[PDB]
Amino acid sequence: AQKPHDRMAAYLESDMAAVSTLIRERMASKHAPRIPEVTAHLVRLRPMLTLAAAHLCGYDGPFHINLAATVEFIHTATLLHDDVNKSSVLVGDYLFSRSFQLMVETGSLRVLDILANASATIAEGEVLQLTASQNLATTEEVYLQVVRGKTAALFSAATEVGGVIAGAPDDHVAALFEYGDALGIAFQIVDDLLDFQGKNIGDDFRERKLTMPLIKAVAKADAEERAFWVRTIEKGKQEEGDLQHAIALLHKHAALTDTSVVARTQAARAKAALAPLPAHPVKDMLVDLADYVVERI
Amino acid sequence: AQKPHDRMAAYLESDMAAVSTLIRERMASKHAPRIPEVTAHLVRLRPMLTLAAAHLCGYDGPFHINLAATVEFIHTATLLHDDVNKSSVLVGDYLFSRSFQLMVETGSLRVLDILANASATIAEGEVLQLTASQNLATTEEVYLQVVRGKTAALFSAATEVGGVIAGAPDDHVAALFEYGDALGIAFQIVDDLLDFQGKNIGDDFRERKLTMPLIKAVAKADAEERAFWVRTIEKGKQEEGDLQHAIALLHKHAALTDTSVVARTQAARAKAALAPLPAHPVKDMLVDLADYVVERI
Numbered sequence: 001a002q003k004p005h006d007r008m009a010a011y012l013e014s015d016m017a018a019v020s021t022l023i024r025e026r027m028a029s030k031h032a033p034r035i036p037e038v039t040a041h042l043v044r045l046r047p048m049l050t051l052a053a054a055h056l057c058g059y060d061g062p063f064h065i066n067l068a069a070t071v072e073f074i075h076t077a078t079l080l081h082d083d084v085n086k087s088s089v090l091v092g093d094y095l096f097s098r099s100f101q102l103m104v105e106t107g108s109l110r111v112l113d114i115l116a117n118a119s120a121t122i123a124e125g126e127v128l129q130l131t132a133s134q135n136l137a138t139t140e141e142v143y144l145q146v147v148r149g150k151t152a153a154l155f156s157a158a159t160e161v162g163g164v165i166a167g168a169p170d171d172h173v174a175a176l177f178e179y180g181d182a183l184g185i186a187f188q189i190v191d192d193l194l195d196f197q198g199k200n201i202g203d204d205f206r207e208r209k210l211t212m213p214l215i216k217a218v219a220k221a222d223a224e225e226r227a228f229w230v231r232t233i234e235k236g237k238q239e240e241g242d243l244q245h246a247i248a249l250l251h252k253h254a255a256l257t258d259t260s261v262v263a264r265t266q267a268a269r270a271k272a273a274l275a276p277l278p279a280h281p282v283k284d285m286l287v288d289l290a291d292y293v294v295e296r297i
Numbered sequence: 298a299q300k301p302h303d304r305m306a307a308y309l310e311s312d313m314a315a316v317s318t319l320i321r322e323r324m325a326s327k328h329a330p331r332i333p334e335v336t337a338h339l340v341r342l343r344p345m346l347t348l349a350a351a352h353l354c355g356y357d358g359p360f361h362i363n364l365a366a367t368v369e370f371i372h373t374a375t376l377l378h379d380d381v382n383k384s385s386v387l388v389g390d391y392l393f394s395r396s397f398q399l400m401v402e403t404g405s406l407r408v409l410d411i412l413a414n415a416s417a418t419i420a421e422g423e424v425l426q427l428t429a430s431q432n433l434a435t436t437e438e439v440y441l442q443v444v445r446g447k448t449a450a451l452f453s454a455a456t457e458v459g460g461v462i463a464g465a466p467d468d469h470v471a472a473l474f475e476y477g478d479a480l481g482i483a484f485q486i487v488d489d490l491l492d493f494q495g496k497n498i499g500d501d502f503r504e505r506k507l508t509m510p511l512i513k514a515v516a517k518a519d520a521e522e523r524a525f526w527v528r529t530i531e532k533g534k535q536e537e538g539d540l541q542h543a544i545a546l547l548h549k550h551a552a553l554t555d556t557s558v559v560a561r562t563q564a565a566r567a568k569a570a571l572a573p574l575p576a577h578p579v580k581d582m583l584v585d586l587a588d589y590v591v592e593r594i
């Protein structure tokens with residue numbers, strides 16, 4: 001999957017350069033000089049999705065660059081905010097404001113709607129996460145909502161705005177959205193998976209954050225096992241030996257193999273969502289990307 | 298100034314109701330139920346400026362309601378963020394996202410530009426504040442920038458978008474902007490003033506936040522006085538007696554009378570900025586408002 005991944009990068013090489021130029025130039029604040037030391041310090045596939053999607057639909061113009069920059073600004077600002085100290089909040093807010101300026105300059109209300117609704121979903125997931133983390137009532141169906149918010153919504157928006165700015169027909173656009181949604185879900189399930197499969201390991205477990213493997217394990221917990229889950233997640237109390245026991249319970253209940261399967265299934269869904277589109281070298285790159293996202297499992 | 302202030306309220310009575318309905322209905326999150334307990338708990342002249350400005354320019358339609366809601370969403374989200382714990386950041390971000398949805402629905406790229414640039418100014422001030430707070434190099438001219446960001450930019454944007462959505466000519470719009478800018482500056486200088494003039498008192502002093510009265514005092518500090526300023530602001534070290542001494546130095550250097558004068562001058566500037574506009578009952582309300590903002594000094 002290496003040479004296939006490199007081809008996408010090399011094709012988008014120039015646009016990625018010209019984006020990362022914008023990110024650089026807009027992180028520069030007219031008045032305050034106390035920003036660029038933090039922004040440069042913090043500065044990818046999300047902005048790549050937007051450019052790829054634009055080229056796939058034959059876009060000549062300049063605004064795909066704006067939109068891909070917006071996409072990264074939004075991802076970064078969201079990261080800062082999760083790392084919560086005062087310096088983060090306000091710097092993220094700054095990037096949000098800058099992201100908003102960039103989309104407005106494109107002249108497209110449609111993409112603004114798309115990114116406005118996406119930002120709603122993202123922020124809505126972040127809060128849903130607060131509640132659903134450390135809460136053994138959480139179904140998988142509820143975790144998928146969390147995943148969309150925290151992860152997939154931006155993927156799907158990134159790809160969708162790339163098609164919209166290109167002026168693509170509504171079927172091509174829905175397919176771009178579905179590609180990005182499924183790819184984002186796969187992307188995040190892979191992360192979930194690798195937090196167990198071979199510093200990193202058990203992180204979600206200590207964090208008391210309900211990953212899919214944990215949901216699938218808890219879903220089969222007898223009284224004995226429930227007490228263990230009730231204790232290390234909802235009470236937060238953990239000791240020596242507790243990570244090894246959690247992992248044993250995952251394996252006992254096929255929680256990892258089964259999560260691997262959902263990952264692979266969403267990744268196949270991504271590729272299928274490209275089907276109706278007419279053939280195109282970027283179409284191929286996006287297929288390879290769907291495989292690349294799940295290669296590590 | 299009471300009956301004159303009440304007339305504005307009573308004229309805008311219905312629109313304010315119908316806005317606070319929106320704020321209520323959009324704070325409701327489809328999926329996550331862990332928001333409305335915080336948003337209702339947190340929910341004014343800013344949204345009033347937008348409605349007033351729309352009516353002043355003869356706007357029939359519905360979007361002045363959207364825009365005034367956006368204005369409050371933005372003010373609130375900004376408040377939350379300054380109060381920084383994790384629950385704040387994400388709830389504010391949620392209101393920002395919701396504010397963005399509302400402006401997009403208006404169909405006006407111009408107002409989006411206005412509010413996108415304003416959001417930039419606001420966030421840019423917040424960061425400039427970090428540096429300029431606890432920094433005796435700060436001139437008044439630098440404080441005015443802080444004031445615009447933290448305060449006036451939203452006033453001026455609130456009034457300006459009200460005129461733009463109404464479709465008013467460019468001269469009427471610039472005057473609305475200038476009214477709101479000067480009014481916001483006056484508004485904030487008044488706050489600065491009342492943090493000394495008669496729990497509240499000395500707050501900015503303990504906070505090591507460079508209010509205008511402090512700038513004007515420091516600006517005249519000899520070596521003896523500088524050492525006192527260098528110590529209680531840049532070193533943060535304060536003892537018994539230090540507030541009384543600061544206040545003495547303000548009076549010694551006419552720092553309050555002089556700040557009062559800048560307040561009054563900006564408020565007169567606000568009213569003058571309405572001059573070219575044709576006469577109108579809301580025009581009168583905005584004049585009274587300019588006097589009302591400075592009545593407490």
Ligand SMILES: [Cl-]
Nearest residue numbers: 254255256257
């Ligand atoms: Cl397994």
Ligand SMILES: [Cl-]
Nearest residue numbers: 551552553554
């Ligand atoms: Cl004085």
